[PDB]
Amino acid sequence: IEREQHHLIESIEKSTQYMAKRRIGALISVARDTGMDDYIETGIPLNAKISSQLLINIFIPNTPLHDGAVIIKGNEIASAASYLPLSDSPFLSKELGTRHRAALGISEVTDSITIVVSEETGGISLTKGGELFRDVSEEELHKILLKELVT
Ligand SMILES: Cc1cccc(NC(=O)CN(C)CC#N)n1
């Protein structure tokens, strides 16, 4: 499982870096100890092997799988186009869109790690436990994913 988490990290990193250069909006939520099955069930089931290639193809704009969140559970991309709870926090900047609000929302009610790619800026953001790491560098993203996902 140790190699699966590292492959998960590398897949997120490659897909997000690919989509960030192209300003392709993306929203990837990795479940952890708390189940996210209710929101998996809101999307289109994939139950697919994790890969950067599939993550990218899912988020291509105007495609059947892009409008929503990808939820990763265990060693599978469980679903795409899932809905996530939107945070009601007035602290979150109005310059950020609903992807960040969804990413903040799910982080308030689960211990899940959620990664966002802004289609406006290409900035990669991350949410965990109700907090937002906005516009992280590749180094910062790699350290956070290593810390939070390799357990
Ligand atoms: C991934 C994503 C993108 C845009 C909006 C949302 N979330 C909602 O629309 C909130 N619903 C009403 C609750 C649920 N589930 N999620």
The helix-helix angle for 138-149 and 2-21 (nearest 10°) equals 150
Atom of ligand 1 nearest to the CA of 68: 1
Name residue, tokens 């939107």. 86
Q: Which of 106, 108, 18, 85 is nearest to 54 (CA)?
A: 18
Pairing of β 113-117 and β 26-30: antiparallel
In sequence order, which residues have a C-beta less than 8 Å from that of residue 137 and are 6 or more positions away?
none
Phi and psi (nearest 5°) for 124? -95, 125
Radius of gyration of the CA atoms of the chain, in A: 14
Detail the DSSP E strand segments found in 3-144: 26-30, 44-49, 69-73, 76-82, 113-117, 124-128, 131-133
CA of 26 from ligand 1 middle (Å) equals 14
User: Which residues are registered as beta bridge partners of 44?
Assistant: 80
Cα–Cα separations (whole angstroms), residue 136 to 13, 46, 47, 73, 142: 12, 28, 29, 24, 9
What resolution (Å)? 2.2
CA of 84 from ligand 1 middle (Å) equals 4
Q: Give the domain CATH number at 23.
A: 3.40.1700.10
Phi-psi domain of 138 (left: phi exceeds 0; alpha: psi -120 through 50; beta: other): alpha
CB 8 within 8 A of CB 104: no
Atom of ligand 1 nearest to the CA of 39: 15
Single-letter code of the amino acid located at 47: N
Q: How was this structure determined?
A: X-ray
Q: Which helix (H) or strand (E) holds 140?
A: helix 138-149
Residue 77: domain span:
1-151
Single-letter code of the amino acid located at 138: E
Q: How many helices (H) and strands (E) does the chain have?
A: 5, 7
CA of 85 from ligand 1 middle (Å) equals 5
Domain count, the chain: 1
CB 135 within 8 A of CB 143: no
